[PDB]
């Protein structure tokens, strides 16, 4: 129906959560054993933390899931007061229930303040007997050690290609779509372990098609829908810097940046990534290139004039790769 593919292709059970396997196996062992300690699912966004907790909560709590599970979000307009109010009201009510272990899913807890995190730790300690928390976050360095020590941390890694491609195959056949192998490879390498990005780009590619029935999606379609540098453009810029004149290198760099709307930071990162694949005769080449490009990126972040920064990029690459020759 008229819904995004993100919600349509949500993992309705723990068997549909691909990529993350250690976490799913541990969670299944937890539910089979019955020991469900306080959980902290953290990692890069789109890894499948909310999907995992929703699937587990449904699997344990059947039909009563609606009343036995409260899904919070600290980023909303509540603050420490209303957030604490809701948690204590849900945890201390002991409503008429079939069993127990009311679950509270607090999403976006890295935005919770230090006092709020300490209060949440105290509330978790007080109501452990009847309420189990599965605090969710994206970065573990924004969480206080008090909250980090009262929950069983479960890091989520970016999904491996073997999985992303499996979900590609699953969504493609059901939605009647064709992905050319180069386009599929581009999408897999551009998602960077983000299944949500995959679904959004796939839906946009479906909408882009003049006839979304049998038209195959090409590489350029994905690289322009996501808004990312094509490998050909970065490679052309790199080869123009490496083997052409200063004026021609400047012309190619400016033309590519203007035509593709590409900032210099993305160009530097893509050039570094491409040059990683290639081998260099000398080592001072790599050392000087990495150091100079990092300095250029740091200066770009602070501010300046882009012409001198682009000239510095070209000169740094040229000097580094004339060191090897």
């Amino acid at each position: 129906e008229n819904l995004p593919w993100v919600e349509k292709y949500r993992p309705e059970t723990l068997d549909e959560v691909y990529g993350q396997n250690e976490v799913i196996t541990t969670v299944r062992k937890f539910v089979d054993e019955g020991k469900l300690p306080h959980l902290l699912f953290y990692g890069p966004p789109g890894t499948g933390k909310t999907s995992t907790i929703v699937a587990l909560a449904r699997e344990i709590y059947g039909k009563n899931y609606s009343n036995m599970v409260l899904e919070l979000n600290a980023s909303d307009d509540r603050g420490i007061d209303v957030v604490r109010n809701q948690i204590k009201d849900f945890a201390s009510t002991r409503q008429i229930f079939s069993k127990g272990f009311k679950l509270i899913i607090l999403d976006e807890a890295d935005a919770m303040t230090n006092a709020a995190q300490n209060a949440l730790r105290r509330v978790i300690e007080r109501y452990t007997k009847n309420t189990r928390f599965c605090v969710l976050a994206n970065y573990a360095h924004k969480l206080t050690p008090a909250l980090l020590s009262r929950c069983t941390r479960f890091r989520f890694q970016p999904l491996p290609q073997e999985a992303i491609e499996r979900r590609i195959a699953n969504v493609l056949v059901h939605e009647k779509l064709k992905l050319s192998p180069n386009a599929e490879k581009a999408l897999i390498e551009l998602s960077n372990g983000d299944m949500r990005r995959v679904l959004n780009v796939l839906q946009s590619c479906k909408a882009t098609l003049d006839n979304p029935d049998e038209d195959e999606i090409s590489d350029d379609v994905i690289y322009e829908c996501c808004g990312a540098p094509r490998p050909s453009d970065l490679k052309a810029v790199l080869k123009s810097i490496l083997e052409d004149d200063w004026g021609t290198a400047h012309y190619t760099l400016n033309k590519v940046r203007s035509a593709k709307g590409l900032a210099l930071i993305d160009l530097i990162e893509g050039i570094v990534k491409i040059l990683e694949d290639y081998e260099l005769q000398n080592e001072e080449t790599r050392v000087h290139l990495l150091t100079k490009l990092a300095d250029i990126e740091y200066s770009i972040s602070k501010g300046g004039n882009d012409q001198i920064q682009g000239s510095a990029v070209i000169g740094a690459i040229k000097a580094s790769f004339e060191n090897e020759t």
Binding site: A116, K142, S232, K235, A236, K239, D277, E279
Partner: protein, 474 residues
Amino acid sequence: RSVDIPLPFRTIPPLNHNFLPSDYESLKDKNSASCIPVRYQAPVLLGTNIKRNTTLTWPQLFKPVTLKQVLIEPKLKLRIKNWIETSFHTLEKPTEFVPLMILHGNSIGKKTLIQTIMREIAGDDNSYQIYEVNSNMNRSKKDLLDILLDFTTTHYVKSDYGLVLFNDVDVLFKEHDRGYWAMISKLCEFSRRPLVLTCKDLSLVPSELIALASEQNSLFHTKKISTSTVYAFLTKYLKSLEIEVCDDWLRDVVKQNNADIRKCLMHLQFWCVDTEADLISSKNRLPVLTSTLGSSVKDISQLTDLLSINDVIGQATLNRSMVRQEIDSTTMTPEKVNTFQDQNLDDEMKLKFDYVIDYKLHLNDPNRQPLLPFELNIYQHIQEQLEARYSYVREANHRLDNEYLVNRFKKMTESTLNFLASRIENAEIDLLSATTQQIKAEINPFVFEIAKSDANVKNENFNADPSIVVRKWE
């Protein structure tokens, strides 16, 4: 397009991680050289003193009994005592005298002084009746005006040596303690008993009360007492308890507690129990510190460059925290001031987020918040490693400050303005309009040149009083 880069491809070798337990044993933390907690002797309790086996706190066990034991200069003691006696005698007669004392300053005995004066005046503890209005209660008009008016209007049921003391008159809530200064004014109009006000700062007190008190010479400043007298009092107190202690540790206790008799007495109440455990490190000793010459200038050049880079790192990362620290609710933030400005809120809502009344706006940056103790701080590690082997780094850490070199700038500008005004107002505004850097670099040094030139001709014998500016730069 292929646009192949003129570089051969690299075949990445396959990385494997099989770590022997011998490599795991290398993870043991090397013994830190920066850490150096040096212990002191255990306290030697002599005899069986009755004061040692007490049930009251040591700050209250050594409560002053006369006006000689309070840690306040005798001149101000006599002034306050005479003022209280004169107020008692004057208010006894039917009544130009408004009973009001502002006992401001940063001293400690700002409340026991009044109690000791009452004890001396009355001669007995039961005779005097001091009604202390502390911050632990609601000091609002509709909660205390009637009570204070009745107390200061009629006689206590029992010479009526009655007094009202307003402890901590500086910390006042906006909504909880509503109409407090109106209560003070109304009491001053219709009182027959003295009214003592104590604060740590005089800014919060309204200027009307300040002027009224200054007219009657009833504005007394409590200056902090030097650490020598505090140390002597502590030594005498410990002699009364008959407790031996090395004088170095007692000096450290006096120094680290900011010469606070109550804080020092609590610290001694803890750290002087009959146990064999060694004492607190107090002033940490040098971590085998050797502030050597460093031999070649290359080594000291590297050390100074590392120090400069570390200072840059500290300035860049000591105020950028990753955890969103909260803003205190009971602070005068501009949002709180504008929130109470809006009249849509009723009394009950204003009770929830009542703020302490202050004269300084509490601004804060939600992004540039100070680092939490558990967050990574490499600057501290570099500083503690460099200080452990070079003393001049630790000296440089406190040779200059932020409050210092700014108060010095203020005093230098004041001296410059005085010398300029002493010419044989317009400067006060226009030179202030001139940028601070300009005054620092050009105006003040040249004013010093003129001052030394005019001091030279005065010794030989267009401006007067040049010695102040001469002394400021020296």
